Amino acid sequence: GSWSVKELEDKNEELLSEIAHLKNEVARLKKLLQRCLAANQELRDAIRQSNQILRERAEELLHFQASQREEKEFLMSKFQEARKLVERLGLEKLELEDKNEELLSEIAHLKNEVARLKKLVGER
Amino acid sequence: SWSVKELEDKNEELLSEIAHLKNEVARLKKLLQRCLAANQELRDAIRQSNQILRERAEELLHFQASQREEKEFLMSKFQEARKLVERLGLEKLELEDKNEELLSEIAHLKNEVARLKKLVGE
């Protein structure tokens, strides 16, 4: 047969020792694959969260901005009506000051006239 | 004591078991390297997303710094205008009072002038 009993028993023990190594290797790789898929699950969980935060930061920024534009607009309207009031009041104060000057000019004339006339009453 | 034939057949049985376990080693090796590479792409996506996250937060912080200063400045002009409105409204009231007084002074001076012209025959 060419191979004797002793030669085949020796080969059989070599194949058994090789099965033992390959079984150990299968066990080691099953354990690495398991830990690797666990780590994959944590990274997909992390990615999703980072994205959920990105999306909420972006909507928040849009509501805040619309809110800000509404209060800036209302404050500007209050400022502009106050500034118009300043200019209107300035303009009425000036027309009134001008009237008062005419009135005082008339009063000056009327006081000169009563003086002239009182001197003439003192001489009749 | 096993015969040559029985041992040859066991030899072949052990070779088939070896061939199965070599297929299982190669299957596992390929799933693992696929999963290691998928994890490395996820860690590169996480890095990028967090960097963007950092940049937005810094841009937002300085943006709200600038908005708050613009609003404080506009509120400051409004308050100053209001102070001016109050003061000017008081000065206006005083000038209007003076106007009314002067019209009464004129009306009485005119009556007096007329009475004096009578007296002097003018």
From Swiss-Prot, chain A:
Phosphorylation at Ser-50 attenuates aminoterminal homodimerization. Neddylated by TRIM40, resulting in stabilization of NFKBIA and down-regulation of NF-kappa-B activity. Changing residue 50 to A: Increases formation of homodimers. There is a cross-link at residue 93 (Glycyl lysine isopeptide (Lys-Gly) (interchain with G-Cter in ubiquitin)). Heart, brain, placenta, lung, liver, skeletal muscle, kidney and pancreas. It is found in: Cytoplasm; Nucleus. The modification Phosphoserine is found at residues 50, 67. Residues 33-93 are annotated as: Interaction with CHUK/IKBKB. It comes from the Eukaryota. Regulatory subunit of the IKK core complex which phosphorylates inhibitors of NF-kappa-B thus leading to the dissociation of the inhibitor/NF-kappa-B complex and ultimately the degradation of the inhibitor. Its binding to scaffolding polyubiquitin plays a key role in IKK activation by multiple signaling receptor pathways. Can recognize and bind both 'Lys-63'-linked and linear polyubiquitin upon cell stimulation, with a much higher affinity for linear polyubiquitin. Could be implicated in NF-kappa-B-mediated protection from cytokine toxicity. Essential for viral activation of IRF3. (Microbial infection) Also considered to be a mediator for HTLV-1 Tax oncoprotein activation of NF-kappa-B. Homodimer; disulfide-linked. Component of the I-kappa-B-kinase (IKK) core complex consisting of CHUK, IKBKB and IKBKG; probably four alpha/CHUK-beta/IKBKB dimers are associated with four gamma/IKBKG subunits. The IKK core complex seems to associate with regulatory or adapter proteins to form a IKK-signalosome holo-complex. The IKK complex associates with TERF2IP/RAP1, leading to promote IKK-mediated phosphorylation of RELA/p65. Part of a complex composed of NCOA2, NCOA3, CHUK/IKKA, IKBKB, IKBKG and CREBBP. Interacts with COPS3, CYLD, NALP2, TRPC4AP and PIDD1. (Microbial infection) Interacts with Molluscum contagiosum virus protein MC005; this interaction inhibits NF-kappa-B activation. The leucine-zipper domain and the CCHC NOA-type zinc-fingers constitute the UBAN region and are essential for polyubiquitin binding and for the activation of IRF3. It is linked to Ectodermal dysplasia and immunodeficiency 1: A form of ectoderma dysplasia, a heterogeneous group of disorders due to abnormal development of two or more ectodermal structures. EDAID1 is an X-linked recessive disorder characterized by absence of sweat glands, sparse scalp hair, rare conical teeth and immunological abnormalities resulting in severe infectious diseases. Severely affected individuals may also show lymphedema, osteopetrosis, and, rarely, hematologic abnormalities. The phenotype is highly variable, and may be fatal in childhood. Immunodeficiency 33: An X-linked recessive disorder characterized by variably impaired immunologic function and early-onset recurrent infections, usually due to pneumococcus, H.influenzae, and atypical mycobacteria. Features of hypohidrotic ectodermal dysplasia are generally not present, although some patients may have conical teeth or hypodontia. This is NF-kappa-B essential modulator. It comes from Homo sapiens. The gene is IKBKG. The chain holds residues 51 to 112 of 419 of the full protein.
